[PDB]
Design a protein around this ligand. Structure first.
Ligand SMILES: O=C(O)/C(O)=C(Cl)\C=C\C(=O)c1ccccc1
Ligand SMILES: O=C(O)/C(O)=C(Cl)\C=C\C(=O)c1ccccc1
Ligand code: NA
Ligand code: NA
Lengths: 276, 276
């Protein structure tokens, strides 16, 4: 699946990093989320052709995901700082700067991380259902609401349940269900996954109210009102914790805005980037 | 001021009602707020030419304001129900239906009122810093924050303070300051004003969580993050109380979105109306 895009690879301080790109002009990096088997092209396939009419759009796989190197976790700590520094390395590897940057969930954590640590690389930031204020205790409120995502049996019909929990009325095609099922069991990245989630659950995915107020570039914050994973109240907190932030909340919408409303996701973000 | 628009008048069940219109096509009604001396053209002059490129845009003066009849309050109760029924009468007077409808503050109260009572007239609703959940007790939290708006001396330099409280960084021209000063002392509408605000302060400007969930058409909810009059937390509550509602929060922005960011106000609402 997804062979419409050409896989490319670049070295990021020793991490061989998979990415796809399309379009010309100003750079937009997309950062995928941290679900089991997530990567750039499955998170963003729908939006890529829209963005590519206006910008050079780029999705990469975070360390531990996709076809990017997953360093053995017997020797590599899968911490947030590890993702952030990888993103920064990736950006610099391609030579870009003053990018537009969008992150979903743990990808949001990472985009925010980079915007904090290397602000000179990032002109605009979009946080979408972003894990930027989820505490260790917030992890562990395993509501009924995560029945499917937490007790994932490893089966196809299990993956359908996870997709149906993470979205409001979206109905994935068989090939998407198949691709997400498989990717979720890939040997290469299962270990890295269990480490990534272990660390997250223990340490949360979190920046301080003061860190958040210190972002130096324009910010757009998006969220699905029905998002069962990064609840709308946390997306509101982020809108109120980040002074300059624009806030946009989508109704009848779960955690996958870019997928559930591709058009509207692309319109609002392109408008914020000054391409409409 | 504002002679670029032609004053028109129509009878609404015995209330002679001032309105201006511009443009052609699908109807958009704008409902002004309830500040002292408010009316259609001072609230909306900046947006009118933008909207008029795409729609037939219409701003009217609510009963008690502007050049609309202000029935003597020795004989007329200036209740919310009175504004709502006037709006409904106005809409029907012009023969429209399936309108797009935008209300600011008490105008929001009134637009919401109409959308509840006569849903067949309204296809889309925008609530902007809308007074749709402000209780009697909420009125009376006279924070330091309303120093200027509550202790308004009746002077020009007093009006500058009110404008500077209601906005984030907006700098009104002398003519706007003069026009708002004068309109705030117009004999015809001062009495109606003191009655309107007396009733509001006593009864609040309020619909129930259940009323709000019962709106039957698409809803867009907007607010300024720095709005000192209808605080961002109440605009968020409305976004969460109205299931289908889209929510959009503007940063560096007070209560007058349409005035402080005319372009962005017009873009987001026209997009929601399906004209972009
Ligand atoms: O958007 C996706 O890629 C996705 O389907 C999921 Cl389940 C993402 C989850 C997180 O990033 C996450 C991890 C731990 C806590 C909260 C969110
Ligand atoms: O937007 C305007 O026309 C304006 O400048 C003001 Cl001060 C409006 C105030 C209300 O509608 C209102 C009245 C009572 C309580 C809350 C808001
Ligand atoms: Na669902
Ligand atoms: Na101000």
């Amino acid at each position: 699946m997804f062979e419409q895009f050409e896989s490319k690879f670049i070295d990021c301080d020793g991490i061989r990093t998979h990415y796809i790109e399309m379009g010309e002009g100003d750079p937009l990096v997309l950062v995928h989320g941290g679900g089991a088997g997530a990567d750039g092209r499955s998170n963003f396939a729908d939006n890529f052709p829209i963005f590519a009419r206006h910008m050079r759009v780029i999705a990469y796989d975070m360390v531990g995901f996709g076809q990017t190197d997953a360093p053995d976790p017997a020797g590599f700590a899968y911490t947030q700082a590890a993702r952030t520094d990888h993103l920064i390395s990736f950006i610099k590897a391609l030579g870009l700067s003053k990018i537009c940057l969008i992150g979903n969930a743990m990808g949001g954590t990472t985009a925010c991380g980079a915007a904090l640590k290397a602000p000179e690389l990032i002109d605009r930031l979009v946080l979408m259902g972003a894990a930027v204020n989820i505490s260790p205790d917030d992890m562990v409120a395993n509501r009924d609401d995560l029945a499917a995502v937490m007790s994932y049996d490893g089966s196809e019909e299990g993956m359908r349940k996870i997709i149906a929990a993470l979205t409001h009325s979206y109905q994935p095609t068989d090939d998407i269900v198949h691709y997400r099922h498989e990717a979720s069991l890939r040997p290469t990245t299962t270990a890295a996954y269990k480490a990534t989630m272990g660390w997250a659950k223990q340490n949360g995915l979190y920046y301080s109210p003061e860190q958040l107020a210190s972002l130096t570039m324009p910010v757009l914050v998006l969220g699905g009102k029905n998002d069962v994973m990064v609840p709308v109240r946390k997306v509101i907190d982020q809108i109120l914790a980040i002074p300059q932030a624009i806030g946009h909340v989508f109704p009848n919408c779960g955690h996958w805005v870019m997928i559930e409303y591709p058009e509207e996701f692309c319109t609002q973000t392109l408008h914020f980037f000054g391409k409409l």
